[model samples]
Target chain A: MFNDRVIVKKSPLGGYGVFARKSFEKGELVEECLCIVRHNDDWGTALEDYLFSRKNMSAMALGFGAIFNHSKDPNARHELTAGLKRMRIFTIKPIAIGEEITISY
Target chain B: MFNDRVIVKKSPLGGYGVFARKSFEKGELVEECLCIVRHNDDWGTALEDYLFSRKNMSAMALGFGAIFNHSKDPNARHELTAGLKRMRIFTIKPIAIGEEITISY
Candidate 1:
């Protein structure tokens, strides 16, 4: 869940945001957590309505996966790996200490 | 999870929201879902940051519990009952068919 590696803070943009507690290299797997994959019909129209996706499926990430806010120029991205059974968030670029973590929706 | 009784839909206020498929009387038990309780430290500052709270604990309510959006005068409310081991959502007043289900934050 990367509980020790990241923290949620008040984002300057508006609401709660995710931030790194330490530095990380580009493409580093910062977080790997279990997620509940629900069918697309189960989700509503909000962006927060889903965490990850696989074809007709949507997920509810248990940890930071569902909590990280969005950014157009994101430093992080999420993927459904492990035979598309798991959801992971990784650094897309080098991340500095105390920097907010973001991903593109 | 009450998947058959409720559904997610595009809310008029904005984003995705939870809606009841049928009518309900006041104090009707609408949803009973399992939840993951996380500490306050584990969540960020966003309203979606955590699901439910009990003293020092926070929860991630699976299914409709986490998807129901906020409303000033909510037609429903969530409770940590069953010895506080389970989270349940009940109707606060008469809920019309196809009405959006909401709760206070």
Candidate 2:
């Protein structure tokens, strides 16, 4: 649902992603995209397998996209949906330009 | 909209998640959840600054709630809902109970 609203830029460190093309009001519909993965039972297997591989880590071990590290004092959090395995998020509050959004797991 | 359809169990790893409460039809709305996070430009910063901190890893890095993981071969895929930064998904085929759902990043 990004339309042309998001610009995929080289993230400085590497890779590319959707950037806000404009300023959004608090709670505005900022992004809508699709994930590209394995499903259901297999997903659990991968979660387990990946977790096992990570024997030691002070921080949370994000599997799959786990590399998306987060902090306890995060700007965002996750909202569990009512009837699906899927989880989504919205702003905990208003944000300014040049800020990075982080979802609390 | 889990509607009491999912069960939280002790995953082999540590924390737990919604387990299918019953059988679901393929393409049926099985589990839908929301996330807790920051938004927009801030999302960009997190993606970048986080990438810098990661050092090096071939696998994709999931931030915030990255603890969710997956492999290339997956049973489910994502469907981008228009006009929102939010992404949703459905089964590629009929899914059985006791399955763990994963979305492609």
Candidate 3:
């Protein structure tokens, strides 16, 4: 679940993605989402394709964080904070309404 | 980590507990926390004290879901949804401001 500024929809690249609900200014806070840390990552799962890499652990960001697709030229970026308990999505550049939200992979 | 209605504070019975910033009526939603599935459960650390038992894994709720202490009688309760990736907390009784939130272990 994202804030009022964004919505989740199908992506061209594949799977679900987050899109702007309204235009956003550069450097604005888009979403502050909760995350889960998978401490035991010795095994393999297809989920890693979308997981955040950590030393010996993997992160699964909840809400829109779990769904944001990657792009080399992305309008949005993401970060981890609060002991990896949360993922914060911020606008990297001005975003127009209906634009897809992404982070550099 | 929580809505405006709750605050995180030190607890006498547990390490940390959630306290009410505002009173809540019975059945009010307290939180909808994200979760992670740990496929490995053969052994666990004392950290296991904070985990929720599942058939093949344990759940360590981030934020206040991991912090809510246990009580034989509690003002709040926890439930898992979205394929066990989410924990929703709800008030079971009228909560007073400043009351520590809890659930049955």
Q: Which candidate ranks first by TM-score, i.e. highest?
A: 3
For model 2 chain B, the run of ten residues with the poorest summed lDDT: B49-58
How well is each residue in A14-98 modelled by candidate 3, as lDDT tens digits?
A: 9667899999999998877565565744324535565676676666565557677899898888999746767888998999998
lDDT measured at residue A36 in model 2 versus the true structure, 0 to 100: 21
Once fitted onto the true fold, the runs of candidate 2 whose alpha carbons sit more than 4 angstroms away are A1-105, B1-3, B10-17, B33-40, B44-69
- Write down the DockQ of candidate 1: 0.03
Model 1: residues with Cα > 4 Å off, grouped in runs: A1-105, B45-50, B82-85
Better of 1 and 2 by DockQ: 2
* Docking class for candidate 1: incorrect
Report how far off residue B103 is in candidate 1 (Å): 1.3
C-alpha RMSD by candidate, in order: 14.4, 13.6, 4.8
lDDT of 1 by residue, A1-105 (tens): 124577666788566677899898999987764555556665444334445666876667644566677888999998876444456889999999889998887
In terms of TM-score, how similar is model 1 to the real structure? 0.49
Model 2 lDDT tens row, B73-104: 54455543232222344555665677655444
lDDT of 1 by residue, B44-89 (tens): 4443433566787666764356667778889899888643445678
TM-score of chain B of 2: 0.49
Chain B fold agreement for model 3, TM-score: 0.88
Q: What is the interface RMSD of each candidate, in Å?
A: 12.1, 14.3, 6.5
Docking class of 2: incorrect
